[PDB]
Amino acid sequence: VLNDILSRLDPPEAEVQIDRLITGRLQSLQTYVTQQLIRAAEIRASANL
Amino acid sequence: CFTNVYADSFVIRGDEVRQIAPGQTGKIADYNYKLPDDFTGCVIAWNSN
């Protein structure tokens, strides 16, 4: 929970924690987007067929 | 080289020397002198008993 980190820790370490969270969430989003791209290529092949 | 150099001089007690640093809290940091979290520069302290 981002809000708990913001409210609980001091900014110097909350910044590192939110950096970790942002990296993780960005990686998850990138994985989802790549999977969507591949599945959409599959569906485009199906639609061409 | 730098475009701005600002020597800030004052006196504290030894236990409070730790408070003169970015991201610190306490009497001195909260109410007397507060550095920015992204402070760039040097802090120098020496006993003057």
Curated annotation (Swiss-Prot), chain A:
Impact after mutating residue 6 to F: In strain: Omicron/BA.1
Function according to Swiss-Prot or TrEMBL: Subunit of the fusion protein that is processed upon entry into the host cell. Mediates fusion of the virion and cellular membranes by functioning as a class I viral fusion protein. Contains a viral fusion peptide that is unmasked after S2 cleavage. This cleavage can occur at the cell membrane by host TMPRSS2 or during endocytosis by host CSTL. In either case, this triggers an extensive and irreversible conformational change that leads to fusion of the viral envelope with the cellular cytoplasmic membrane, releasing viral genomic RNA into the host cell cytoplasm.
Name of protein: Spike protein S2'
Organism listed in the record: Severe acute respiratory syndrome coronavirus 2
Gene that this sequence comes from: S
Residues included from the entire protein: 976 to 1024 of 1273
UniProtKB/Swiss-Prot annotation, chain B:
Region (Integrin-binding motif): 13-15
Effect of residue 27 to T: In strain: Gamma/P.1
Consequence the record notes for mutating residue 27 to N: In strain: Beta/B.1.351, Omicron/BA.1, Omicron/BA.2, Omicron/BA.2.12.1, Omicron/BA.2.75, Omicron/BA.4, Omicron/BA.5, Omicron/BQ.1.1, Omicron/XBB.1.5, Omicron/EG.5.1; May enhance affinity to human ACE2 receptor
Function of the protein: Attaches the virion to the cell membrane by interacting with host receptor, initiating the infection. The major receptor is host ACE2. When S2/S2' has been cleaved, binding to the receptor triggers direct fusion at the cell membrane. When S2/S2' has not been cleaved, binding to the receptor results in internalization of the virus by endocytosis using host TFRC and GRM2 and leading to fusion of the virion membrane with the host endosomal membrane. Alternatively, may use NRP1/NRP2 and integrin as entry receptors.
Record text on subunit structure and interactions: Binds to host ACE2. RBD also interacts with the N-linked glycan on 'Asn-90' of ACE2. Cleavage of S generates a polybasic C-terminal sequence on S1 that binds to host Neuropilin-1 (NRP1) and Neuropilin-2 (NRP2) receptors. Interacts with host integrin alpha-5/beta-1 (ITGA5:ITGB1) and with ACE2 in complex with integrin alpha-5/beta-1 (ITGA5:ITGB1). May interact via cytoplasmic c-terminus with M protein. May interact (via N-terminus) with host bilirubin and biliverdin, thereby preventing antibody binding to the SARS-CoV-2 spike NTD via an allosteric mechanism.
Protein name (record): Spike protein S1
Organism whose genome encodes this protein: Severe acute respiratory syndrome coronavirus 2 (2019-nCoV)
Whole sequence portion shown: 391 to 439 of 1273
